[PDB]
């Protein structure tokens, strides 16, 4: 039970009819008027659906592929090949972990450099065979570890940025969880970017911004709101292409329905790129990122 659902916990207690109908009204009211910090908590739920949750509903004959051909197969970054309505595609993304034991195995969807290098290898495979690429962003951030630094965390991300920049196939990214800074952008240099309405995209965690700007990490909520990290915020800035609705209560309430909405958005976004050649697709991505930022001349 989240904090903002306390009204419904109070109302559901003076039931264990008029109240019944109110409770339903109050549920719809709360979930149709979510505040930024409410959305952040929905994004951070253990049961927030993962990349491997959605794939079977969206793609056919998905085959998971492992490794960076260099060091390790990173459990936090998955990928493979499949079909989208008969069109061969590559799919990559961070994999959070469905339960507690799984969270440790998946390192909470926090990739090591080997994870980024694996993503890159799979994207270069897609490019060679002219397959569109779909990426699922779902990470609180790249892993801030000792071994991650030794193995070139920064380099692995930075290389993905410049290699994704000039990819000659369509790339479509969607944030399905948190969008943790450079670690999210490391598989986010796409022609089109989507976000679930309750997903986030931030240059730094709200807790991190709070501790730095106000020296109090308990002001995370204000930091979140001031940075404007919600899907609708990012869309207002023209940085993402579309916001995808979630079922009432959040994506975890109906994975199948959520997946069908994602699939539909994938199709529409990919279709908008249909007429572009290999060189034009890369140039399209160039123009997208080159023109982000506001400044006074």
């Amino acid at each position: 039970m989240l904090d903002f659902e306390k009204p419904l916990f109070e109302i559901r207690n003076k039931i264990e009819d008029m109240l019944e109908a109110s409770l339903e009204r109050e549920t719809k009211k709360i979930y149709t008027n979510l505040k930024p910090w409410d959305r952040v908590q929905i994004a951070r739920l253990q049961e927030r659906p993962t990349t491997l949750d959605y794939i079977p509903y969206i793609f056919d004959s998905f085959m998971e592929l492992h490794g960076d051909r260099n060091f390790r197969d990173d459990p936090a970054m998955i990928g493979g090949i499949g079909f989208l309505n008969g069109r061969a595609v590559t799919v990559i993304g961070q994999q959070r972990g469905k339960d507690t034991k799984d969270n440790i195995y998946r390192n909470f969807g926090m990739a090591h450099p080997e994870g980024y290098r694996k993503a890159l290898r799979l994207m270069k495979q897609a490019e060679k065979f002219n397959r569109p690429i779909f990426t699922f962003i779902d990470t609180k951030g790249a892993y801030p570890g000792k071994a991650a630094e030794e193995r070139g965390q920064s380099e692995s991300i930075a290389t993905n940025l410049i290699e994704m920049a000039s990819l000659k196939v369509p790339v479509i990214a969607i944030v399905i969880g948190e969008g943790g800074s450079g670690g999210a952008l490391g598989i986010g240099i796409a022609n089109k970017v989507l976000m679930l309405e309750n997903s986030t995209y931030s240059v730094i965690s709200p807790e991190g911004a709070a501790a730095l700007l106000w020296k109090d990490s308990n002001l995370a909520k204000i930091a979140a709101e001031t940075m404007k990290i919600t899907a609708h915020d990012i869309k207002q800035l023209g940085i993402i292409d579309d916001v995808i609705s979630e079922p009432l209560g959040g994506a975890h309430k109906d994975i199948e329905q959520q997946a069908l909405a994602i699939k539909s958005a994938f199709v529409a976004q990919l279709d908008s790129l249909e007429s572009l050649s290999r060189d034009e697709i890369a140039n399209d991505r160039f123009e997208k990122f080159r023109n982000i930022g506001s400044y006074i001349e």
Binding site: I157, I239, S294
Partner: protein, 255 residues
């Protein structure tokens, strides 16, 4: 007129220190070099032409106090923003340059820095010039939120086009180079160079120590450490900087 070395506490004349390119005479500690002094040290006298000198930051997120914080850093440093860009020559060879200055909002990268960097890179591409970028960044430009994050992608597209044109990019990582700057243009030079003891990495020592619950080595994240771990072509004492750059430029001089 005096400068105290932050590491060995030795007092020196500011003028003599500067003539030594801000390297401590006593302990060899490399003290930060400001943007224009860095440029002076690596170019032929009078060859520098500054680009976009007057570009200034906006407040697209309406973040409270942001523009007030910028004004203060401007007054303190005399810079418009945390990067100075332009063209210059070294031993008669022309190059594009960008020098970040960590005195200004910690050298954190916002829209202005992203645009100024892209403009010089794109200029270099159109005119077939090599490009050298001195990184210095100690955190995120959080006041511009998602827009600052995107600057990593923005600078990368320009950078990869420059590279795809067959042109040289020297990444010169200076102290400190962390976060998004480290995880974007700073780590992908054709040749990556740094300076003794410079700290370079994705996450800070404190966050990593807390995450892993262990003590990190004293040399962790130093330029020397990155060289050992395959991430730098060369660690370069400032005394050799000008000659190393001249030699690399000469090797890469087209046709």
């Amino acid at each position: 007129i005096m400068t105290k070395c932050p590491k060995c506490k030795k007092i020196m004349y500011t003028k003599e220190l500067a003539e030594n390119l801000n390297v401590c005479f006593n302990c060899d500690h490399h003290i930060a070099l400001t943007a224009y002094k860095r440029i002076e040290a690596i170019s032929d006298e009078g060859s520098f032409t500054e680009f976009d000198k007057g570009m200034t930051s906006a407040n697209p997120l309406d973040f409270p106090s942001y523009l007030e914080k910028i004004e203060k850093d401007q007054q303190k440093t005399g810079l418009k923003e945390a990067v100075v860009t332009g063209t210059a020559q070294l031993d008669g060879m022309k190059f594009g340059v960008a020098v970040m200055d960590s005195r200004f909002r910690m050298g954190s990268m916002g829209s202005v820095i992203g645009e100024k960097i892209c403009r010089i890179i794109d200029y270099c591409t159109e005119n077939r010039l090599p490009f050298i970028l001195f990184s210095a960044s100690g955190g995120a430009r959080m006041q511009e939120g998602i827009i600052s994050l995107m600057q990593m992608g923005k600078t990368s597209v320009s950078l990869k086009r420059h590279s795809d044109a067959g042109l040289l990019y020297i990444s010169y990582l200076t102290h400190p180079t962390t976060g998004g700057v480290s995880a974007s243009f700073a780590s992908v030079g054709d040749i990556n160079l740094s300076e003794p003891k410079a700290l370079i990495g994705f996450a800070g020592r404190r966050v990593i120590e807390q995450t892993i619950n262990e003590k990190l080595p004293d040399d962790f994240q130093t330029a020397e450490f990155l060289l050992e771990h395959g991430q730098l072509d060369k660690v370069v004492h400032r005394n050799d900087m000008r000659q190393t750059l001249s030699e690399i430029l000469k090797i890469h001089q087209e046709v």
